[PDB]
Amino acid sequence: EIVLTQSPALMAASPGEKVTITCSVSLSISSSNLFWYQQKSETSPKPWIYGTSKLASGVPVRFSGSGSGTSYSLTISSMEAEDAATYYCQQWSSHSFTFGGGTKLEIKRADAAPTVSIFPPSSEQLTSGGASVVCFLNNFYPKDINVKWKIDGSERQNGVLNSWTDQDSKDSTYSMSSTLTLTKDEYERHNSYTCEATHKTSTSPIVKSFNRNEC
Amino acid sequence: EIVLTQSPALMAASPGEKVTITCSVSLSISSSNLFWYQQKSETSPKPWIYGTSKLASGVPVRFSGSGSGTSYSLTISSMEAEDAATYYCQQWSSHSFTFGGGTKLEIKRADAAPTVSIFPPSSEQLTSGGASVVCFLNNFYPKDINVKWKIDGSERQNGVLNSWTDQDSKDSTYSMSSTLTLTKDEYERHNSYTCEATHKTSTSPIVKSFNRNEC
Amino acid sequence: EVQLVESGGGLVKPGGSLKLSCAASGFTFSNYAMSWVRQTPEKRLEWVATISNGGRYTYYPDSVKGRFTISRDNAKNSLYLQMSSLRSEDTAMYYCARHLYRYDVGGALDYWGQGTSVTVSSAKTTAPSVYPLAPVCGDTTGSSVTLGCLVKGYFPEPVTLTWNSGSLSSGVHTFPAVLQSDLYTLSSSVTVTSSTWPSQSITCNVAHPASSTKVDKKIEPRGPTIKP
Amino acid sequence: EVQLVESGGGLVKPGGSLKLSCAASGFTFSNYAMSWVRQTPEKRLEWVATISNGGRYTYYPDSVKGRFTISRDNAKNSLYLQMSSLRSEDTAMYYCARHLYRYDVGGALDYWGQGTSVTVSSAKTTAPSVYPLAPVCGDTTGSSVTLGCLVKGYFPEPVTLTWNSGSLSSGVHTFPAVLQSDLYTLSSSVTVTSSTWPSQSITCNVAHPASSTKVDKKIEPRGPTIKP
Amino acid sequence: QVMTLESWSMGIVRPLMEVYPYAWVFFIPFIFVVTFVMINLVVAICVD
Amino acid sequence: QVMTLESWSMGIVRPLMEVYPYAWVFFIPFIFVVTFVMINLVVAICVD
């Protein structure tokens, strides 16, 4: 069947910047059947543009995109801060639907250092024969960050559980959790446990750790 | 215009008793426009019988009422305990609507003595220069009851606030509140305050009172 | 999805106006006729107005003729009713009703609304006063104990009374209020176990939205009136 | 009053069936066509089925032909979809969609539903374990304090985590879970004022409806591990 | 259905003209052609 | 109603074809009977 291809998959912007996406086609297709969709966080998507130029209801006048032939686009003139979502483009076929890949936009703000707080395992997991050292990293910009685990200087990369967050609408920062899960005997063979935060905003990775002081 | 008249205004029954109401007319009227309605407690009414014999949806088969001419009726064969409500009958005219008066039914159960608890006025009303002696009477059957107020033997009937209750669906009893509101100087000129309950289930009215013991 | 709700109402001085509404959803509104039926608080029903589907033919009883105004707009899918120069015997409940058969006027009425209270009087809007209640004493101090809450001196109807934000609802007796000398008086009682009180602290919650009065009072277990 | 909700779904072993539904309300259901669109969790959309208004003409992609079953009943005003002999790449999100123009098939899609998750895997249904968190110490004991709650070892998706029955919602960071070795692991954190804690007692509320697990844990403020 | 002039406008053609906006060119000559035949099919009987 | 050609398609026959698939065989020859006799009736008056 017909297949579509998008560009770019990821692109960021600031309020006051004018952006334009692409939906590339694999064969020449008329204008009267090609549709746009917008999906926010945890929302079932909504129709956006019917028939490649005409807008739908509930759409402000800052939205247009046109053309013909084998290449189409969607241009936001004065981009708001609520336009950080994922788009889709559709084309109808002989008897099949075919959507696109996905087109995500991001909001930029100022740089910051990550805020780091490491937690010890609770007492009830120690009764269960296990241990789990969690090192939270919340409210940082941008998304790209790398962390390490140091057990008495030894860089351990085994038993690491990482998961990032959606871009917040409150401040446009990011958050992350890194988990060092151990066993009961492994947690008592060593003393120091160190999680660090390597980021482009500070050339020295700050150290937030804990000892076995009453532990 | 046409006017309607009902009978009886009040009538009671027990489960296992077969009841029949009346809706009397003032002039001869055909059958095809006369409608019934049922109103529970604090519910906007619902249509009940369309066209003087045919039932509506959501109606069990124990409900019918018929006739012609100048007199109509509604008969419940095996009366439930949820049929204690108020009915209405409608007739359409030249260009006016005309409903009925209202037809209330009650559920009977065994007799009982009233449960009486009298409360003193609170301290904050005493600061406001007033007093209010409330004598509650809850969960009694039937509705008909008479109470008195005795202030050192003197039967006072001035300053009495009475209000009964709807028939409960839990036990088919009734409740009542009687309030003796006084002033601050009047509440200190006497000592004893007595509310009594005169009812057909006990030929001696029981006495629930309070004194000025630490009051 | 057939639904009928209302709006408007409240307090109007004798000599004022009021313009109600009726929201209709689910059927096709441009193929029925619609009519307002009123309910007196003395348990008697009465008819107010009606209007056909197209909006050109109205009908009125003679007892209120020339004073009320009823209209329809098809695209808005809602019903109006406009009043002017009211009287005192309009203190009752209102409803909004759809006729049974299509295109018809004056048959039966199958689906009503729920109600909106309108009272016209010559009183003044006040705020309630809440008083907790506690018994004097008890012989042998049995397990059945009762507490009460008194709401006296407010205007107008209605007021809301709950218990610990609506936690408990069993063994409670809500009483209908009585208007005495332009002040409403409401009383309530609740019967709990003598092991629950005073071990569990309860609070009479009173919500009076007509004067924006939110007074919460708890029960003091019979403090004696002594002073050294 | 245009609404579209769903039902069904859950966990199916590879080798089972599942029969979904779609509830439609508000428009006239006998004058549109209706179609199921699926959403992969790797952020990609895909089409499943469609059916015209009368219910006689169906269309199917070739990748799933002869396996799914779609039908309509006009009086019931709801949509079906019947599955049999599933596979492993059906672990995704489903939707129910109405076409744009009347009487049509295959144009656009204007009003969708909201979603229903279906996962087919070879794991076993377990119950979560909840662990409260508290920091070790702090230099100068500043006013910014953070507490956490760990939910590890449950199956399947989803699970619900609130704080004091959903009292506080500011300064909280809910994290997406990660599946490791047929056990889901979820973590959460909240940052409050050091004057609030331990003066205000908070409790991590975890609701796991797939195994009917309701474990509530509160934070102990760093009890030292000593024993005389 | 379209020959006997029943609901060819509010139920057949005007939903087609939301998708194929030159559909009238097919159905408006057709209403001519057969209806010409129809009245000629009356007049023959009158001659007979 | 089906004789005088009004709403025989979108109101009578086509909601019978959802249940009975072969319903048209009863109603399409009926249109070919009565209508025929009708125009024959018209021809009678013209003859006179």
PDB file of C-alpha atoms in Angstrom, chain C residues 4-228:
ATOM      1  CA  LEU C   4     -34.159  18.208  31.357  1.00  0.00           C
ATOM      2  CA  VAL C   5     -32.566  20.560  33.901  1.00  0.00           C
ATOM      3  CA  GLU C   6     -33.296  24.144  34.887  1.00  0.00           C
ATOM      4  CA  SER C   7     -31.775  27.389  36.151  1.00  0.00           C
ATOM      5  CA  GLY C   8     -32.729  30.746  37.621  1.00  0.00           C
ATOM      6  CA  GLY C   9     -34.935  31.411  40.600  1.00  0.00           C
ATOM      7  CA  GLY C  10     -34.185  32.564  44.115  1.00  0.00           C
ATOM      8  CA  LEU C  11     -35.731  35.570  45.856  1.00  0.00           C
ATOM      9  CA  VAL C  12     -37.672  38.341  44.106  1.00  0.00           C
ATOM     10  CA  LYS C  13     -39.274  41.292  45.875  1.00  0.00           C
ATOM     11  CA  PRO C  14     -42.979  41.904  45.109  1.00  0.00           C
ATOM     12  CA  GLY C  15     -42.583  44.225  42.162  1.00  0.00           C
ATOM     13  CA  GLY C  16     -39.756  42.478  40.304  1.00  0.00           C
ATOM     14  CA  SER C  17     -39.054  40.135  37.411  1.00  0.00           C
ATOM     15  CA  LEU C  18     -37.364  36.780  36.813  1.00  0.00           C
ATOM     16  CA  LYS C  19     -36.273  35.043  33.605  1.00  0.00           C
ATOM     17  CA  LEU C  20     -35.920  31.266  33.839  1.00  0.00           C
ATOM     18  CA  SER C  21     -34.503  28.660  31.459  1.00  0.00           C
ATOM     19  CA  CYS C  22     -34.760  24.972  30.579  1.00  0.00           C
ATOM     20  CA  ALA C  23     -31.954  22.862  29.106  1.00  0.00           C
ATOM     21  CA  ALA C  24     -33.005  20.049  26.777  1.00  0.00           C
ATOM     22  CA  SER C  25     -30.749  17.278  25.527  1.00  0.00           C
ATOM     23  CA  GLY C  26     -31.070  13.948  23.744  1.00  0.00           C
ATOM     24  CA  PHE C  27     -34.134  13.994  21.482  1.00  0.00           C
ATOM     25  CA  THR C  28     -34.792  16.137  18.430  1.00  0.00           C
ATOM     26  CA  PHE C  29     -36.020  19.385  19.959  1.00  0.00           C
ATOM     27  CA  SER C  30     -37.594  20.774  16.785  1.00  0.00           C
ATOM     28  CA  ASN C  31     -40.360  18.137  16.763  1.00  0.00           C
ATOM     29  CA  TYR C  32     -42.160  18.487  20.085  1.00  0.00           C
ATOM     30  CA  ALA C  33     -44.038  21.022  22.114  1.00  0.00           C
ATOM     31  CA  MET C  34     -42.966  22.124  25.525  1.00  0.00           C
ATOM     32  CA  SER C  35     -44.769  23.403  28.597  1.00  0.00           C
ATOM     33  CA  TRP C  36     -44.181  24.701  32.151  1.00  0.00           C
ATOM     34  CA  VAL C  37     -46.126  23.099  35.024  1.00  0.00           C
ATOM     35  CA  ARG C  38     -46.003  24.468  38.578  1.00  0.00           C
ATOM     36  CA  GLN C  39     -46.276  22.718  41.937  1.00  0.00           C
ATOM     37  CA  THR C  40     -47.613  24.572  44.959  1.00  0.00           C
ATOM     38  CA  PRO C  41     -46.021  23.705  48.341  1.00  0.00           C
ATOM     39  CA  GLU C  42     -49.507  22.852  49.650  1.00  0.00           C
ATOM     40  CA  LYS C  43     -49.492  19.690  47.440  1.00  0.00           C
ATOM     41  CA  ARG C  44     -51.444  20.893  44.407  1.00  0.00           C
ATOM     42  CA  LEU C  45     -50.418  21.127  40.741  1.00  0.00           C
ATOM     43  CA  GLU C  46     -51.192  23.927  38.298  1.00  0.00           C
ATOM     44  CA  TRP C  47     -50.483  24.760  34.645  1.00  0.00           C
ATOM     45  CA  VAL C  48     -48.617  27.882  33.493  1.00  0.00           C
ATOM     46  CA  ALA C  49     -47.915  27.951  29.751  1.00  0.00           C
ATOM     47  CA  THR C  50     -47.319  25.948  26.587  1.00  0.00           C
ATOM     48  CA  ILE C  51     -45.972  26.551  23.088  1.00  0.00           C
ATOM     49  CA  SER C  52     -45.995  24.538  19.863  1.00  0.00           C
ATOM     50  CA  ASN C  53     -42.906  23.388  17.991  1.00  0.00           C
ATOM     51  CA  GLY C  54     -42.568  26.184  15.448  1.00  0.00           C
ATOM     52  CA  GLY C  55     -42.938  28.914  18.047  1.00  0.00           C
ATOM     53  CA  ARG C  56     -45.856  30.832  16.576  1.00  0.00           C
ATOM     54  CA  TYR C  57     -48.857  29.622  18.611  1.00  0.00           C
ATOM     55  CA  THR C  58     -48.990  30.087  22.383  1.00  0.00           C
ATOM     56  CA  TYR C  59     -51.675  29.346  24.949  1.00  0.00           C
ATOM     57  CA  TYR C  60     -52.279  30.871  28.376  1.00  0.00           C
ATOM     58  CA  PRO C  61     -54.692  30.349  31.261  1.00  0.00           C
ATOM     59  CA  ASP C  62     -56.932  33.308  32.010  1.00  0.00           C
ATOM     60  CA  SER C  63     -55.685  33.651  35.594  1.00  0.00           C
ATOM     61  CA  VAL C  64     -52.217  34.862  34.538  1.00  0.00           C
ATOM     62  CA  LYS C  65     -52.899  36.213  31.039  1.00  0.00           C
ATOM     63  CA  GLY C  66     -50.830  39.044  29.588  1.00  0.00           C
ATOM     64  CA  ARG C  67     -48.178  38.846  32.286  1.00  0.00           C
ATOM     65  CA  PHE C  68     -45.910  35.865  31.494  1.00  0.00           C
ATOM     66  CA  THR C  69     -43.821  35.547  28.327  1.00  0.00           C
ATOM     67  CA  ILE C  70     -42.736  32.236  26.755  1.00  0.00           C
ATOM     68  CA  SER C  71     -40.489  31.690  23.738  1.00  0.00           C
ATOM     69  CA  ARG C  72     -38.327  29.206  21.847  1.00  0.00           C
ATOM     70  CA  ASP C  73     -35.168  29.285  19.770  1.00  0.00           C
ATOM     71  CA  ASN C  74     -34.523  26.183  17.697  1.00  0.00           C
ATOM     72  CA  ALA C  75     -30.742  26.311  17.246  1.00  0.00           C
ATOM     73  CA  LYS C  76     -30.003  26.974  20.928  1.00  0.00           C
ATOM     74  CA  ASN C  77     -31.977  23.860  22.000  1.00  0.00           C
ATOM     75  CA  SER C  78     -33.249  25.472  25.196  1.00  0.00           C
ATOM     76  CA  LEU C  79     -36.487  26.956  26.516  1.00  0.00           C
ATOM     77  CA  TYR C  80     -37.196  30.344  28.124  1.00  0.00           C
ATOM     78  CA  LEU C  81     -39.907  31.902  30.309  1.00  0.00           C
ATOM     79  CA  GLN C  82     -40.026  35.622  31.136  1.00  0.00           C
ATOM     80  CA  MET C  83     -41.936  37.046  34.098  1.00  0.00           C
ATOM     81  CA  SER C  84     -42.765  40.618  35.119  1.00  0.00           C
ATOM     82  CA  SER C  85     -44.643  42.289  38.007  1.00  0.00           C
ATOM     83  CA  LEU C  86     -44.955  39.218  40.206  1.00  0.00           C
ATOM     84  CA  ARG C  87     -47.336  38.565  43.083  1.00  0.00           C
ATOM     85  CA  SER C  88     -47.172  36.792  46.436  1.00  0.00           C
ATOM     86  CA  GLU C  89     -48.975  33.546  45.516  1.00  0.00           C
ATOM     87  CA  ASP C  90     -46.125  32.522  43.175  1.00  0.00           C
ATOM     88  CA  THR C  91     -44.124  30.922  46.015  1.00  0.00           C
ATOM     89  CA  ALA C  92     -43.975  27.418  44.587  1.00  0.00           C
ATOM     90  CA  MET C  93     -42.003  24.888  42.536  1.00  0.00           C
ATOM     91  CA  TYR C  94     -41.598  25.014  38.745  1.00  0.00           C
ATOM     92  CA  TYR C  95     -41.019  22.308  36.116  1.00  0.00           C
ATOM     93  CA  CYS C  96     -40.337  21.926  32.389  1.00  0.00           C
ATOM     94  CA  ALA C  97     -42.247  19.263  30.467  1.00  0.00           C
ATOM     95  CA  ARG C  98     -42.313  17.654  27.011  1.00  0.00           C
ATOM     96  CA  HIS C  99     -45.557  16.475  25.432  1.00  0.00           C
ATOM     97  CA  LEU C 100     -46.055  12.869  24.416  1.00  0.00           C
ATOM     98  CA  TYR C 101     -47.029  12.648  20.766  1.00  0.00           C
ATOM     99  CA  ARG C 102     -45.038  14.337  18.037  1.00  0.00           C
ATOM    100  CA  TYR C 103     -46.066  17.702  16.545  1.00  0.00           C
ATOM    101  CA  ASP C 104     -48.870  17.875  19.115  1.00  0.00           C
ATOM    102  CA  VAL C 105     -50.100  20.260  21.760  1.00  0.00           C
ATOM    103  CA  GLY C 106     -51.958  19.312  24.921  1.00  0.00           C
ATOM    104  CA  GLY C 107     -51.925  15.537  25.251  1.00  0.00           C
ATOM    105  CA  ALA C 108     -49.976  14.031  28.125  1.00  0.00           C
ATOM    106  CA  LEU C 109     -46.498  14.764  29.481  1.00  0.00           C
ATOM    107  CA  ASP C 110     -43.868  12.012  29.577  1.00  0.00           C
ATOM    108  CA  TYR C 111     -40.512  13.442  30.677  1.00  0.00           C
ATOM    109  CA  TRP C 112     -40.256  16.299  33.139  1.00  0.00           C
ATOM    110  CA  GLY C 113     -37.339  18.043  34.738  1.00  0.00           C
ATOM    111  CA  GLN C 114     -36.508  18.118  38.438  1.00  0.00           C
ATOM    112  CA  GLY C 115     -37.445  21.535  39.820  1.00  0.00           C
ATOM    113  CA  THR C 116     -36.379  25.065  40.770  1.00  0.00           C
ATOM    114  CA  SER C 117     -37.762  26.945  43.760  1.00  0.00           C
ATOM    115  CA  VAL C 118     -38.996  30.533  43.467  1.00  0.00           C
ATOM    116  CA  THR C 119     -40.241  32.482  46.497  1.00  0.00           C
ATOM    117  CA  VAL C 120     -41.548  36.062  46.463  1.00  0.00           C
ATOM    118  CA  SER C 121     -41.857  37.611  49.923  1.00  0.00           C
ATOM    119  CA  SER C 122     -41.211  40.764  51.942  1.00  0.00           C
ATOM    120  CA  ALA C 123     -38.512  39.494  54.321  1.00  0.00           C
ATOM    121  CA  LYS C 124     -34.756  40.156  54.522  1.00  0.00           C
ATOM    122  CA  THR C 125     -31.853  37.818  53.764  1.00  0.00           C
ATOM    123  CA  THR C 126     -30.111  36.723  56.976  1.00  0.00           C
ATOM    124  CA  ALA C 127     -27.484  34.186  58.099  1.00  0.00           C
ATOM    125  CA  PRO C 128     -28.105  31.134  60.323  1.00  0.00           C
ATOM    126  CA  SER C 129     -26.888  30.479  63.853  1.00  0.00           C
ATOM    127  CA  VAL C 130     -25.680  26.982  64.755  1.00  0.00           C
ATOM    128  CA  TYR C 131     -25.928  25.548  68.279  1.00  0.00           C
ATOM    129  CA  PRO C 132     -24.642  22.093  69.295  1.00  0.00           C
ATOM    130  CA  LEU C 133     -26.621  19.994  71.750  1.00  0.00           C
ATOM    131  CA  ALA C 134     -25.682  17.567  74.525  1.00  0.00           C
ATOM    132  CA  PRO C 135     -27.841  15.827  77.159  1.00  0.00           C
ATOM    133  CA  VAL C 136     -27.993  16.789  80.826  1.00  0.00           C
ATOM    134  CA  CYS C 137     -27.432  13.397  82.490  1.00  0.00           C
ATOM    135  CA  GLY C 138     -28.605   9.799  82.410  1.00  0.00           C
ATOM    136  CA  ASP C 139     -29.711   7.145  84.877  1.00  0.00           C
ATOM    137  CA  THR C 140     -27.385   4.078  84.592  1.00  0.00           C
ATOM    138  CA  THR C 141     -25.729   5.825  81.510  1.00  0.00           C
ATOM    139  CA  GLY C 142     -26.968   3.361  78.897  1.00  0.00           C
ATOM    140  CA  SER C 143     -25.330   2.713  75.543  1.00  0.00           C
ATOM    141  CA  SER C 144     -27.929   4.685  73.540  1.00  0.00           C
ATOM    142  CA  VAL C 145     -26.887   8.352  73.425  1.00  0.00           C
ATOM    143  CA  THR C 146     -28.366  11.121  71.267  1.00  0.00           C
ATOM    144  CA  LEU C 147     -26.923  14.444  70.084  1.00  0.00           C
ATOM    145  CA  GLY C 148     -28.539  17.327  68.228  1.00  0.00           C
ATOM    146  CA  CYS C 149     -27.852  20.410  66.127  1.00  0.00           C
ATOM    147  CA  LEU C 150     -30.041  23.527  65.974  1.00  0.00           C
ATOM    148  CA  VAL C 151     -30.160  25.951  63.025  1.00  0.00           C
ATOM    149  CA  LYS C 152     -32.352  28.961  63.807  1.00  0.00           C
ATOM    150  CA  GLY C 153     -32.822  32.383  62.249  1.00  0.00           C
ATOM    151  CA  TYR C 154     -31.988  32.229  58.550  1.00  0.00           C
ATOM    152  CA  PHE C 155     -33.538  33.319  55.254  1.00  0.00           C
ATOM    153  CA  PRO C 156     -34.366  32.163  52.646  1.00  0.00           C
ATOM    154  CA  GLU C 157     -34.943  28.522  51.805  1.00  0.00           C
ATOM    155  CA  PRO C 158     -32.788  26.289  51.405  1.00  0.00           C
ATOM    156  CA  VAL C 159     -29.951  25.346  53.764  1.00  0.00           C
ATOM    157  CA  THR C 160     -27.668  22.292  53.823  1.00  0.00           C
ATOM    158  CA  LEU C 161     -26.856  20.290  56.970  1.00  0.00           C
ATOM    159  CA  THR C 162     -24.430  17.341  56.934  1.00  0.00           C
ATOM    160  CA  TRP C 163     -22.371  15.424  59.511  1.00  0.00           C
ATOM    161  CA  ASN C 164     -18.549  15.253  59.192  1.00  0.00           C
ATOM    162  CA  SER C 165     -18.782  16.200  55.480  1.00  0.00           C
ATOM    163  CA  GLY C 166     -21.451  13.552  54.964  1.00  0.00           C
ATOM    164  CA  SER C 167     -19.679  10.640  56.643  1.00  0.00           C
ATOM    165  CA  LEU C 168     -22.526   9.189  58.722  1.00  0.00           C
ATOM    166  CA  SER C 169     -26.070   8.875  57.394  1.00  0.00           C
ATOM    167  CA  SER C 170     -27.650   6.094  59.503  1.00  0.00           C
ATOM    168  CA  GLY C 171     -29.695   6.781  62.611  1.00  0.00           C
ATOM    169  CA  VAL C 172     -30.157  10.430  61.617  1.00  0.00           C
ATOM    170  CA  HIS C 173     -33.485  12.271  61.401  1.00  0.00           C
ATOM    171  CA  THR C 174     -33.552  15.366  59.181  1.00  0.00           C
ATOM    172  CA  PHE C 175     -36.498  17.592  59.984  1.00  0.00           C
ATOM    173  CA  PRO C 176     -38.381  20.037  57.737  1.00  0.00           C
ATOM    174  CA  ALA C 177     -37.909  23.652  58.741  1.00  0.00           C
ATOM    175  CA  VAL C 178     -40.640  25.963  60.038  1.00  0.00           C
ATOM    176  CA  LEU C 179     -40.826  29.659  59.158  1.00  0.00           C
ATOM    177  CA  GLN C 180     -41.659  31.844  62.170  1.00  0.00           C
ATOM    178  CA  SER C 181     -41.652  35.665  61.869  1.00  0.00           C
ATOM    179  CA  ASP C 182     -39.468  35.880  58.726  1.00  0.00           C
ATOM    180  CA  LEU C 183     -36.846  33.523  60.205  1.00  0.00           C
ATOM    181  CA  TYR C 184     -36.458  29.853  59.327  1.00  0.00           C
ATOM    182  CA  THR C 185     -35.724  27.373  62.112  1.00  0.00           C
ATOM    183  CA  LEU C 186     -34.312  23.899  61.467  1.00  0.00           C
ATOM    184  CA  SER C 187     -33.504  21.095  63.902  1.00  0.00           C
ATOM    185  CA  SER C 188     -31.709  17.766  63.569  1.00  0.00           C
ATOM    186  CA  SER C 189     -30.810  14.796  65.757  1.00  0.00           C
ATOM    187  CA  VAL C 190     -28.515  11.774  65.588  1.00  0.00           C
ATOM    188  CA  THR C 191     -28.330   8.719  67.863  1.00  0.00           C
ATOM    189  CA  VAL C 192     -24.989   6.940  68.284  1.00  0.00           C
ATOM    190  CA  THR C 193     -23.420   4.448  70.692  1.00  0.00           C
ATOM    191  CA  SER C 194     -22.185   5.746  74.062  1.00  0.00           C
ATOM    192  CA  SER C 195     -18.820   4.088  73.359  1.00  0.00           C
ATOM    193  CA  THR C 196     -18.458   6.094  70.130  1.00  0.00           C
ATOM    194  CA  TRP C 197     -19.043   9.513  71.787  1.00  0.00           C
ATOM    195  CA  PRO C 198     -17.006  11.328  73.133  1.00  0.00           C
ATOM    196  CA  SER C 199     -14.322   8.939  71.828  1.00  0.00           C
ATOM    197  CA  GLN C 200     -15.146   9.982  68.250  1.00  0.00           C
ATOM    198  CA  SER C 201     -15.405  13.724  67.618  1.00  0.00           C
ATOM    199  CA  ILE C 202     -18.321  14.755  65.400  1.00  0.00           C
ATOM    200  CA  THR C 203     -19.118  18.191  63.986  1.00  0.00           C
ATOM    201  CA  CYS C 204     -22.404  19.586  62.696  1.00  0.00           C
ATOM    202  CA  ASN C 205     -21.666  21.019  59.240  1.00  0.00           C
ATOM    203  CA  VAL C 206     -24.101  23.708  58.054  1.00  0.00           C
ATOM    204  CA  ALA C 207     -23.955  25.174  54.530  1.00  0.00           C
ATOM    205  CA  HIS C 208     -26.139  28.225  53.837  1.00  0.00           C
ATOM    206  CA  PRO C 209     -25.425  29.287  50.228  1.00  0.00           C
ATOM    207  CA  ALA C 210     -28.014  32.091  50.200  1.00  0.00           C
ATOM    208  CA  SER C 211     -25.869  34.126  52.626  1.00  0.00           C
ATOM    209  CA  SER C 212     -22.558  32.217  52.081  1.00  0.00           C
ATOM    210  CA  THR C 213     -22.589  31.040  55.704  1.00  0.00           C
ATOM    211  CA  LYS C 214     -20.396  28.049  56.639  1.00  0.00           C
ATOM    212  CA  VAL C 215     -20.566  27.490  60.414  1.00  0.00           C
ATOM    213  CA  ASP C 216     -19.226  24.239  61.878  1.00  0.00           C
ATOM    214  CA  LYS C 217     -19.915  23.341  65.514  1.00  0.00           C
ATOM    215  CA  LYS C 218     -18.930  20.342  67.634  1.00  0.00           C
ATOM    216  CA  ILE C 219     -20.570  18.979  70.779  1.00  0.00           C
ATOM    217  CA  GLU C 220     -19.143  19.665  74.238  1.00  0.00           C
ATOM    218  CA  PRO C 221     -20.070  16.784  76.592  1.00  0.00           C
ATOM    219  CA  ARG C 222     -22.138  18.703  79.200  1.00  0.00           C
ATOM    220  CA  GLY C 223     -19.833  21.238  80.761  1.00  0.00           C
ATOM    221  CA  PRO C 224     -21.346  22.233  84.105  1.00  0.00           C
ATOM    222  CA  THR C 225     -22.097  25.885  84.826  1.00  0.00           C
ATOM    223  CA  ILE C 226     -19.866  26.461  87.856  1.00  0.00           C
ATOM    224  CA  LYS C 227     -17.235  29.105  88.586  1.00  0.00           C
ATOM    225  CA  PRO C 228     -14.983  29.363  91.690  1.00  0.00           C
TER     226      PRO C 228
END
